[PDB]
């Protein structure tokens, strides 16, 4: 390990967290990142970490999960941090405030967070203009193995969920390498019901028609982000719809409304989605299930509790082609990105994989 990793993890981050409420801390993190005020990213990505998936090259398989940069303000700073790809959002069609404060909570004893933001969003028009200001810069980044994802949500008061997602495809689709249909936020009433077979089929048919209507150079992959709290029936149904419609991939998983036995944080019974270590293995097992149900033919972005190279490799071996993290960044700071990549490379070598690609779904072939 490096000195930076230790300093951030043991001293700087815990000290700053002791001084700032979680939302203020988040806002400062976005601001600092957007301005490029970050420790020097020492880790050079090796060829072993390159993944080709979703019609793109990814320089490394470690991305920033949705919810950190909700409004597309810090994309370049996130690449500077060493992320192989950036996902922004969720973005709603109209601007909306989200829930009253406080709405984010740290569980330090669990290395977890609970949030109930409720899709606070600058809205499609603001984010569209923000991305347009760097659209050609992004085109070059994408070509150089650094793709951009855009995660779409729906407004609280909308009377037509499918039309909300359709508007997101039309407005932000042309600026994204991939789009995410987020039907798994636990913080918007009725949203998770869109994961049901009939609702999902209707919704995704509309989303895919809108995507297919975009010009070729502006036509993103479409992925669906799912909950960790689905029944076996729900998962079978999602896999069936994914295959029927030719959905490009899955993001597995969002936060959990479960509260695993053993949580110690004083704030464990706050309403919202739980992220970080207590989610890790629930997410891994959901990746494992979804990979098997889709016969390994549908790319999966694995997310939930990734804080180390071992966490990343477990999700990759379970069937993820790429991974994302968020909560680990909140505890360990920017050095966690290089840490995960360096550990992942070392483990791939130790386990006799030629690269990340060889390890994808390896557990299913044991
Ligand atoms: C504060 C916070 C805000 C989030 N906002 C979003 C969001 O807007 N859209 C989304 O799809 N996921 C959102 N997520 C979920 C993350 O993208 C990710 O699925 C989840 O936190 C698991 O990863 P982690 O354990 O590495 O944080 C959010 C998570 C947190 C902690
Ligand atoms: C350059 C940086 C300075 C960070 C200062 C700080 C105090 C971060 C903790 C933190 C939290 O405590 C919490 Cl609760 C959240 C949600 C977030 C959400 O992002 C979060 O970043 C970052 C590391 O990129
Ligand atoms: O905005 C939020 O509350 C939010 C959205 C989401 O998809 N996941 C999450 O944990 N929080």
UniProtKB/Swiss-Prot annotation:
It is found in: Mitochondrion inner membrane. It catalyses: (S)-dihydroorotate + a quinone = orotate + a quinol. It comes from the Eukaryota. The active site is at 185 (nucleophile). Its EC number is 1.3.5.2. Pathway: Pyrimidine metabolism; UMP biosynthesis via de novo pathway; orotate from (S)-dihydroorotate (quinone route): step 1/1. Pfam families: DHO_dh. Binds 1 FMN per subunit. Keywords: Disease variant, Flavoprotein, FMN, Membrane, Mitochondrion, Mitochondrion inner membrane, Oxidoreductase, Pyrimidine biosynthesis, Transit peptide, Transmembrane, Transmembrane helix. GO terms for cellular component: cytosol; mitochondrial inner membrane; mitochondrion; nucleoplasm. It is a single-pass membrane protein. Catalyzes the conversion of dihydroorotate to orotate with quinone as electron acceptor. Required for UMP biosynthesis via de novo pathway. This is Dihydroorotate dehydrogenase (quinone), mitochondrial. The lineage of its organism: Eukaryota, Metazoa, Chordata, Craniata, Vertebrata.
